[PDB]
Nucleic acid binder design. Structure first.
Length: 206
RNA sequence: AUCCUUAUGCACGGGAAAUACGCAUAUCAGUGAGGAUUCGUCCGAGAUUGUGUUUUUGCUGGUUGAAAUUAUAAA
RNA sequence: GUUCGCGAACUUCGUGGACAUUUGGUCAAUUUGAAUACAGAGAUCAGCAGUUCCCCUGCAUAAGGAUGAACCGUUGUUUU
C-alpha cells in the first residue's frame, strides 16, 4: 500500500548462476560477477558500517552518561590494607591508576618511603573487591625490582616485604574526597594525616 | 584501556526444517507440568483443551501462449 | 412359424437343438415465445525474501570476571 522503496533479489556467488531478474547474467559474465560480488561486499560493508556506527554512538553516549551520573551514594564499602614496604614504582603506579579508574575514594599513606604503610580504599563494592584482588593476587609485594636513578640503577631484593588486608567494612560516610597517596617522615604525622578525615583508627600498629 | 563468560538485542555469513509453526477473555501447572528407575531413586517444565494455517505466506523474473495489435496529414 | 445340423427323392418330406423383453444412453450455456452454440475457458520454467531452529562472525547493552601499563601526587649586590 506504499511502494516507498523496492525489494530486489539478494544474489550471492551461489545464486549468481540462477538469478535472471537483473540483466547481463550470461551476456557479460565478468560484469555480472562484479555486480554480484560487489553487491555481496556492500552487504558485508553495510553490516560492518552499521557496527562501526553503533560503536561510535555508544562511545558518544558513554562519555556524556558518566558525566550525567552524579548519583547520591547510599553506602560505601571500604578496605584498609597494610604493607611492610613499597620501594617498587610498579606497585605504586598500580595503586594510582587503578584507583583513578575505579572512582575509588581513599588513599595510600606510609612512613619513610621504604617503611611500612597503609592503604584505605573506599567505594562501590565491586570496585573494592577488584582493588583487593589487585593488591593480593595480581601484585607480588615479595618481588625483586629495580630503582632507576641518576647515580645508578639500584636492585632491591625484598623477600621480607609482605601485604595484609586489615579491614573490609562499611563506612557510615566516606570522608575521602579522592585518592590521596602520601608519604610521611614520622608516625605522628601519619596519624594526623589520617585524622584529617576525622578517622585515625584505620591504622594498626604491630 | 586489553582479553574472555553468560544472556539477550541487531545484523553479516553458513546451514537444517516447515508433519511445522502459531494464537487463545480457556482449564491446570516449580505451593510440581510431564517424565525417567538399576526401585534405593533420578530428571525437572510444560501439559490439557480449543483452534488458524500447515504438498506452504509475501513478492519478483522469464518463456510463452492468449492471437499477442502500430500515431496525423498537406500537396 | 424362424434359423443351424443330419437321412431320402436349390426344392420338398423324416428329424436333433436354439428362439422373451425393456430401465438403467437427456450435453450444459445463451437467444426463445426451436435456433445458436458444441463440452465450457491461464500454462509451464525459475529467483528472492519471509517463518522456525541451529552454528559461526562483528557490534550493542546488561551483568560478571581476568589482565596490563613509569612515578611521586593533593588537603650592603647573582635563585624571589
Amino acid at each position: 500500500l506504499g511502494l516507498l522503496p523496492k525489494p530486489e533479489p539478494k544474489v550471492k556467488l551461489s545464486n549468481m548462476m540462477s538469478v535472471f531478474e537483473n540483466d547481463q547474467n550470461i551476456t557479460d559474465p565478468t560484469a555480472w560477477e562484479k555486480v554480484v560480488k560487489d553487491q555481496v561486499d556492500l552487504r558485508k560493508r553495510k553490516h560492518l558500517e552499521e557496527n562501526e556506527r553503533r560503536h561510535e554512538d555508544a562511545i558518544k553516549r558513554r562519555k556524556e552518561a558518566v558525566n550525567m551520573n552524579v548519583e547520591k551514594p547510599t553506602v560505601y564499602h571500604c578496605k584498609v590494607f597494610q604493607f611492610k614496604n613499597l620501594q617498587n614504582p610498579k606497585i605504586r603506579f598500580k595503586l594510582k591508576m587503578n584507583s583513578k579508574e575505579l572512582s575509588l575514594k581513599g588513599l595510600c599513606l606510609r612512613i619513610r618511603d621504604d617503611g611500612p604503610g597503609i592503604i584505605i580504599v573506599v567505594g562501590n563494592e565491586k570496585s573494592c573487591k577488584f582493588y583487593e584482588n589487585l593488591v593480593m593476587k595480581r601484585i607480588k609485594w615479595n618481588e625483586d625490582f629495580e630503582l632507576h636513578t641518576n647515580t645508578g640503577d639500584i636492585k632491591m631484593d625484598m623477600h621480607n616485604n609482605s601485604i595484609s588486608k586489615t579491614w573490609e567494612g562499611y563506612l557510615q560516610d566516606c570522608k575521602f574526597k579522592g585518592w590521596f597517596m602520601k608519604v610521611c617522615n614520622d608516625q605522628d604525622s601519619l596519624l594526623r594525616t589520617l585524622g584529617q578525615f576525622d578517622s585515625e583508627h584505620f591504622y594498626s600498629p604491630v
